[PDB]
Design an enzyme around this catalytic site. Sequence first.
Site, mmCIF file in Angstrom:
data_model
loop_
_atom_site.group_PDB
_atom_site.id
_atom_site.type_symbol
_atom_site.label_atom_id
_atom_site.label_comp_id
_atom_site.label_asym_id
_atom_site.label_seq_id
_atom_site.Cartn_x
_atom_site.Cartn_y
_atom_site.Cartn_z
ATOM 1 N N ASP A 178 0.795 -1.238 0.000
ATOM 2 C CA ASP A 178 0.000 0.000 0.000
ATOM 3 C C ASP A 178 0.825 1.283 0.000
ATOM 4 O O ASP A 178 0.442 2.272 0.644
ATOM 5 C CB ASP A 178 -1.002 0.020 1.163
ATOM 6 N N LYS A 204 1.732 4.667 -1.129
ATOM 7 C CA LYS A 204 1.093 5.773 -1.835
ATOM 8 C C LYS A 204 1.348 7.045 -1.041
ATOM 9 O O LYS A 204 1.765 6.983 0.112
ATOM 10 C CB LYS A 204 -0.411 5.534 -1.967
ATOM 11 N N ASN A 214 0.151 7.494 2.576
ATOM 12 C CA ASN A 214 0.678 6.514 3.530
ATOM 13 C C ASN A 214 2.129 6.783 3.918
ATOM 14 O O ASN A 214 2.729 6.015 4.677
ATOM 15 C CB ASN A 214 0.540 5.090 2.970
#
EC number: 2.7.11.13
Length: 336
Positions: free
Chosen positions: A133, A135, A138
């Site tokens: 995840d 991105k 994040n």
Amino acid sequence: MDPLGLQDFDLLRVIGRGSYAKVLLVRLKKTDRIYAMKVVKKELVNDDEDIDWVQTEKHVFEQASNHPFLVGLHSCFQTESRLFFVIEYVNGGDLMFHMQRQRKLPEEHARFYSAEISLALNYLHERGIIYRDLKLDNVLLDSEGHIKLTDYGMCKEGLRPGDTTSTFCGTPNYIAPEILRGEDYGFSVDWWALGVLMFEMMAGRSPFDIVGSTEDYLFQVILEKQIRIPRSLSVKAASVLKSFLNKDPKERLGCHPQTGFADIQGHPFFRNVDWDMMEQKQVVPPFKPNISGEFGLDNFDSQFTNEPVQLTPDDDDIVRKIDQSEFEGFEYINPL
């Protein structure tokens, strides 16, 4: 001297909310230290695959050790209705808010962030974890301007080097073509995601942003379209971006079974990085977050920090249906 529970904390602010969790700023009364606290309602995670997934996040948190570029875990406890992860409070904002303000970063700035993220990802991979995840939102900034990866809910753990997994998985803009082609995949998908994020930092747009001039068309573009590097980028930047964004995960920068991370460190784009100083947080960050008022709450979305500082009362009907046995042994305190 019983183990920590909810009563041991002052709740100070609401700072965050995701799919399944509410995040508060808290203070451990005993020690007067400040943490974030991720709160998950058991009624959201009482089924089959939930339990496994809560366990994964828990294990990644532990492995996230006190690695300098990952959010670490202070403790876990539970109530009747809730699970609580007490975690590092990281208050510099995130790279999404950063890009929205800065618009486009100097190559040197993107190199600094990329190097720190590379170190975080490699440390995960060395521990058997795929992040899955990566991105912009994040990637948090801490108060000094160093990065921290957050939100381990998508992770794969327990993986032997060169073993693979197959869950289709992630945020669309960042999803790696292997995944879109239905192929079994390893740590490679993180390095693709880094490529996209780096392109975003240096160009100030997604490499796939033709889509909009059909989120399944996004996928076609990612699979089928050649990425064009903006003319304004250095040759070394074009090169690193091109290598990270190789559609073939076997040829991709960072993805060699033996030399992958060494290939990253030795790439011309990262030539001026001292990876030892970087890892020890001895490189001064290029941007220092503004910390306002008491806790820097201004770097968080006002949608959250405005909320009443409380945990939503439950209805005892739903709560009583929870099989509590499957959360036995949840409690944990870090070993430092």
